């Protein structure tokens, strides 16, 4: 089947350049061409422009010619964006998306996309926090990390339901999420509650058990 | 240069209803004109094409119509899955260009949140840092007011809010408020509290702890 694998997150200074990958496999590389599409956290979608590997052809958005650079490269069927000049504004998800037969068909196979976060902030682990008080209610609070993403889990997966894990918010160049479990009151403290923080930046792992105070 | 306008920006509608939705296009692009569906956290995906034409495996109750500058999207007897964002996009040569998109979401009836609070950590104090948290959890509709109150006066500094997505089992949204304050400021003051104001009532929710208790 049509698969676009997308290079990882990536966090760069303002003023730098950053390269993304997107190799394709499933169809014929060269036949269709590949569109860029940017995707800022919350808000639409906006088009960046194409390259067609056969011969390395490009139409750009002309909001981003002189900004972003399309390449290809045909034996190892992968394209590459490049972005120079960062500022925070290019903190987004970008997609390689491949086209139809012609270029201006619309667009079927979309890849997960590259999250580029522009940042003068140091990478940063999180401190985690518990969150003890027919139904009780506990949390993790996850604080201070610099970028995105953290994982939180619950006795590593098995607590699923009653969670909400809430989205991070930015306050001066640092992350703060916060994740509820809302578990049977009888339960609690007899079975053990949890929270399992990854962050994959600064390769911390945090395992927090919620105690009564 | 070409322009795309979707409304509404959001729709509430509920599982069984018909829904329409427009994208009107700043000049003349004939019947090229498509929709993307993308779900929280998902990549998008296309349903429509050359305004009337379904993707491959898009269910018929999805229906496209219009021509020239104005054009709808007629989904008949929604389904759950059929909830989240859409957008529009010519596709009439280049460049591209996308609708801001039209965010449809469930209706329920109103839901009160349920609410608790979490003085600081012990643990937290020990590093000189005092977060206050307060989860509203499962209220419907999305609109709420949280305020925090140290010995009854407003506190507005160092509030980090966090409002959840749409909850797909139960069609209502979470907010996590922390209020963040050093330890020895924390250590000056007894009495905290949240305070929800929503729909459902004409008084606020409060949730209140003293500090030496």
């Known amino acids: 089947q049509v698969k676009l694998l997308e290079s990882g997150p990536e966090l760069v200074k303002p003023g730098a350049s950053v390269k993304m990958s997107c190799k394709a496999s499933?169809?014929?590389?060269?036949?269709?061409?590949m569109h860029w599409v940017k995707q800022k956290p919350g808000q639409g979608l906006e088009w960046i422009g194409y390259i067609n590997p056969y011969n390395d052809g490009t139409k750009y958005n002309e909001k981003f010619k002189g900004k972003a650079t399309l390449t290809s490269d045909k034996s190892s069927s992968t394209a590459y964006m490049e972005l120079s000049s960062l500022t925070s504004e290019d903190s987004a998800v970008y997609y390689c998306?491949?086209?139809?037969?012609?270029?201006?068909?619309?667009?079927?196979?979309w890849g997960q996309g590259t999250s580029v976060t522009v940042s003068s902030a140091k990478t940063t682990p999180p401190s985690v926090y518990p969150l003890a008080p027919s139904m009780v209610t506990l949390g993790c609070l996850v604080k201070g990390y610099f970028p995105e993403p953290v994982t939180v889990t619950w006795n590593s997966g098995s607590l699923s339901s009653g969670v909400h894990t809430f989205p991070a918010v930015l306050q001066s160049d640092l992350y703060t999420l916060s994740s509820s479990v809302t578990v049977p009151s009888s339960t609690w403290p007899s079975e053990t509650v949890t929270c399992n923080v990854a962050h994959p930046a600064s390769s911390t792992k945090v395992d927090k058990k919620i105690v009564p105070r | 240069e070409l322009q795309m306008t979707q409304s509404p920006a959001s729709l509430s509608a509920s599982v069984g209803e018909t829904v329409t939705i427009t994208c009107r296009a700043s000049?003349?692009?004939?019947?090229?004109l498509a929709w993307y569906q993308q779900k929280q956290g998902k990549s998008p995906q296309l349903l429509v094409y050359?305004?009337?034409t379904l993707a491959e495996g898009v269910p018929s109750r999805f229906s496209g119509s219009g021509s020239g500058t104005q054009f709808s999207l007629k989904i008949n007897s929604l389904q759950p899955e059929d909830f989240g964002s859409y957008y529009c996009?010519?596709?009439?040569?280049?460049?591209?260009?996308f609708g801001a998109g039209t965010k449809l979401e469930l209706k329920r009836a109103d839901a009160a949140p349920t609410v608790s609070i979490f003085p600081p950590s012990s643990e937290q104090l020990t590093s000189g840092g005092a977060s206050v948290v307060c989860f509203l959890n499962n209220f419907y509709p999305k609109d709420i007011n949280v305020k925090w109150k140290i010995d009854g006066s407003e506190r507005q500094n160092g509030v980090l809010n966090s409002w959840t997505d749409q909850d797909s089992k139960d069609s209502t949204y979470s907010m996590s408020s922390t209020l963040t304050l050093t330890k020895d400021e924390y250590e000056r003051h007894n009495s905290y509290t949240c305070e929800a104001t929503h729909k459902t009532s004409t008084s606020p929710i409060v949730k209140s702890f003293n500090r030496n208790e």
């Open positions: 996009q010519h596709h009439y040569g280049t460049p591209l260009t």
């Open positions: 050359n305004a009337k």
């Open positions: 499933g169809y014929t590389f060269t036949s269709y061409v």
């Open positions: 000049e003349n692009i004939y019947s090229y």
């Open positions: 998306v491949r086209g139809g037969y012609r270029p201006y068909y619309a667009m079927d196979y």
